Design a binder for this molecule. Structure first.
Ligand SMILES: [Mg+2]
Ligand SMILES: [Mg+2]
Lengths: 156, 140, 156, 156, 156, 140, 140
């Protein structure tokens, strides 16, 4: 098996794609990136034993947290517009914009290169303005992807 | 070097190939552990040309029918060259201090004439009777 | 690849020496040296010679425990690069150049260098110190930090 | 526009030189200099001459990482401007002038300057130092910080 | 155990002396000394001799309380090791070697030594201090911390 | 050395093998604990060649039929070489300082002349009547 | 030692076994509390060989038919050796300073001439009439 290894954060190339095209949506200047596959766990306990009898998993989603410092006008207009459209104003419709996300990251030694890919990431809220006096603006996204489409060593 | 520094006068130095000059310069650069690597070729060449000219004018002829240059003319011209190269940079270092730490050299304490002011000067000075006036002449 | 040097001072000398002539702003490519290559009375270039850069490590390199495996130190290294010249504009151009040269390798995942990160972290101007009567060197500097995972042989 | 200078010291000199004659309180527009333009024994004005401003960078410029991209540094620069004159009233007026001059450009989008921000951050009085017995220069100063996004070679 | 020593200075001398000849980078195994073994004018090696390591404790050892019981102190000790040689390459190699030797025992559970932990915590370069004219020594150092539980005899 | 340093003049030194020169250099390198290891071989060769020439020119002949070089010509030439090598490194260290600590080497001001200015010079100076003019001659 | 340092000349020293040389070296090392342990064998051997040659050439024979070496030739040669060893190391420290801890050794100006400049020299100097010339001769 591949030896576990340290990872220098800044090595990661995060990208967003329109799932209708696989075309890139411009996004930049990340500071924090957390990607976390999760499930709800249900545990079975009965009078017969104090120990856990069974455990099962359900409600898969991938939590995505991003902090970033370069404003993307395209990304915001995509979020406003919904699937397969861009808008300069809020849209009165029920379809959230779904982004495919991919992050490609070498090991600190180059011993492996993880690609994490996540389908249909959606964000309940989008920051547009995030001003603080005497600072450059900084933005936080919290969202959820449907599943991990790829987690592999990309090297060679 | 092929022509030695004592075999050439000022006009001869100007007639040398660049290689013959560079050989002599390379010989002079042996006289310091630093090699004066931060001073350019032209300035070391000027110092050597000057040392040659100054030997042939100020340190030539006889004194009580001895030569006024008693020591080896090769090493005299080299020490006179090194003296000039040093004076093209400053005095002797009395003290040098870096980003940290220091060294000091007791390079002072001599007399006030130019040759007395530096180590190469004080070496060259022994070759030429220490500038002493031992000349004598008579009626005939 | 470009360096593979045993120590940070040699590594940054190798990076500055590897720079193409076209990436230096002046007509002549600077000479790169260890601080201790030259004696003090001869430090800095002579007239008609190219400018000199002096490289050394001014402060303690930290070794921090990366994890309780003990395979690796998170190693943080410190360097200063001093540019010496008679031309007040040349040192200013050299400061720009050194920042530019060492702004490659910014998140080198041990591809070029033996480090995860080589970065300019600050710069100094000392032109105010040069006495105006005398011809004498102007000095400016780049402060550089350098970070990587350094092996311990604890577990062989 | 007004400056486009390669380094902060020349940038602030260019700003102070760009000031109209109407924006200085005294009758004569001051002469602006780098601290190293003049030797110490003749630093400051003579009698029957305009007051002199000396500009230099007193402390280290910061180059902070802006993001994981490494495309830019958040650069913070520091400058001092000293006003020299024989009139205690003129140096006080010059301090008020320097402040109200360099408080233009307070939030440039690199419009006039190459910076996001040029700001007076403090002021000093040194009139108490001038010995009252002799004729001699009074000195006062303005401390100026300067901030902007600064490019890198990382992505080219 | 390799040391079983009374005090930290002798403990680290014993560790450096216990190293096989194969674990040193140069041809000759260095000589290990207390800083006070040699007089100052004679400090460092002569020509045609192996390089010298000087060990001492530069700063106060802490004795923190471990618990209300008072059976032991949590003791934290500090050491510096200086490598002296005429070869600028040899001191750099020795700095590497000292780290590689003392990076064994990193989490020694009092098996080899009277400590829970012996660790290089940083390293220094002092080669910039050696003046270039004279054949004086180059110096580099490793800073080492050392930690363990030290018995009080409070409860007999 | 097989040919020891008093068995050779400048033209002989230039005719020795590199091995014979290097063994003589190796003997000179015994005169300092530091061996002048960070000064290159050619600089030490130049200093020795210079000392050989300087001995044969400035420290040869007689004074009242006494030899001008009274002591062992081997150790004299070695000391004269070591003196020159030390001057190629900038002279004595009066004091040194750094993260190794500091030391001062008790020189005082010393004398004005080159052989007075360094320890190897002062050792050489005893071999040559302390540079005094003991010479005496008569009509016959 | 079995062959004593006063019983051997320069040629004899080269004929001694390594152990006989080492016994004499071991005796010399008694003259300093440090033993000069950071200086190599070759340099201590060269200092002794030099001291032997220098004794035999500069400190031999007679003045007014007194011996020019009045004191014990054993201890003279040892002190002359120790003088040489100390000069292979910059000379005496007037002060030594380390990790804050500091000392100064009361050496003072210490004259100007070779044997005056270090403690071992100053001891050896009493063995040879303080470099005075009590020499006398007459016509017959
Ligand atoms: Mg005497
Ligand atoms: Mg003389």
């Amino acid at each position: 098996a591949t030896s576990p290894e340290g990872i220098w954060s800044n090595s990661g190339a995060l990208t967003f794609e329109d799932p209708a095209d696989d075309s890139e949506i411009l996004f930049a200047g990340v500071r924090d990136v957390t990607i976390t596959p999760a499930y709800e766990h249900a545990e079975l306990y009965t009078i017969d034993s104090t120990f856990r009898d069974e455990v099962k998993r359900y409600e898969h989603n991938v939590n995505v947290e991003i902090t970033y410092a370069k404003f993307s006008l395209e990304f915001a207009q995509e979020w406003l517009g919904g699937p397969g459209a861009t808008a300069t104003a809020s849209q009165d419709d029920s379809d959230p914009m779904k982004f495919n996300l991919e992050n490609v990251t070498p090991s600190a030694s180059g011993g492996f290169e993880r690609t994490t890919a996540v389908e249909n990431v959606v964000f309940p809220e989008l920051p547009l303005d995030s001003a603080t006096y005497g600072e450059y603006e900084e933005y936080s996204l919290t969202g959820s992807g449907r599943s991990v489409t790829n987690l592999a060593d990309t090297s060679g | 070097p092929d022509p030695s520094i004592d075999e050439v006068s000022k006009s001869d130095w100007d007639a040398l190939t660049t290689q013959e000059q560079d050989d002599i310069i390379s010989q002079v650069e042996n006289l310091s552990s630093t090699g004066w690597v931060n001073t350019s070729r032209e300035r070391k060449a000027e110092a050597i040309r000057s040392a040659i000219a100054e030997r042939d004018t100020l340190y030539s002829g006889n004194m009580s029918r001895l030569p006024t240059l008693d020591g080896d003319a090769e090493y005299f011209t080299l020490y006179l060259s090194a003296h000039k190269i040093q004076l093209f940079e400053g005095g002797e270092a009395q003290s040098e201090s870096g980003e940290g730490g220091s060294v000091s050299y007791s390079t002072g304490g001599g007399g006030e004439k130019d040759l007395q002011k530096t180590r190469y000067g004080r070496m060259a000075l022994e070759y030429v009777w220490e500038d002493n006036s031992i000349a004598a002449l008579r009626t005939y | 690849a470009t360096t593979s040097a045993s120590h940070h001072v040699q590594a940054i000398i190798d990076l500055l020496e590897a720079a193409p002539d076209a990436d230096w702003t002046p007509t002549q490519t600077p000479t790169v040296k260890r601080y201790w290559d030259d004696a003090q009375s001869e430090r800095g270039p002579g007239a008609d010679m190219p400018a000199i850069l002096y490289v050394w490590s001014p402060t303690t390199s930290s070794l921090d425990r990366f994890s309780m495996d003990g395979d690796v130190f998170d190693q943080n290294d410190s360097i200063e690069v001093q540019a010496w010249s008679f031309d007040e504009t040349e040192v200013e151009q050299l400061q720009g150049d050194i920042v530019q040269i060492l702004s490659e390798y910014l998140d080198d995942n041990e591809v070029q260098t033996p480090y995860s990160d080589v970065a300019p972290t600050g710069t100094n101007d000392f032109r105010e110190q040069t006495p105006a009567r005398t011809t004498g060197h102007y000095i400016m500097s780049v402060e550089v930090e350098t970070r990587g995972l350094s092996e311990t042989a604890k577990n062989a």
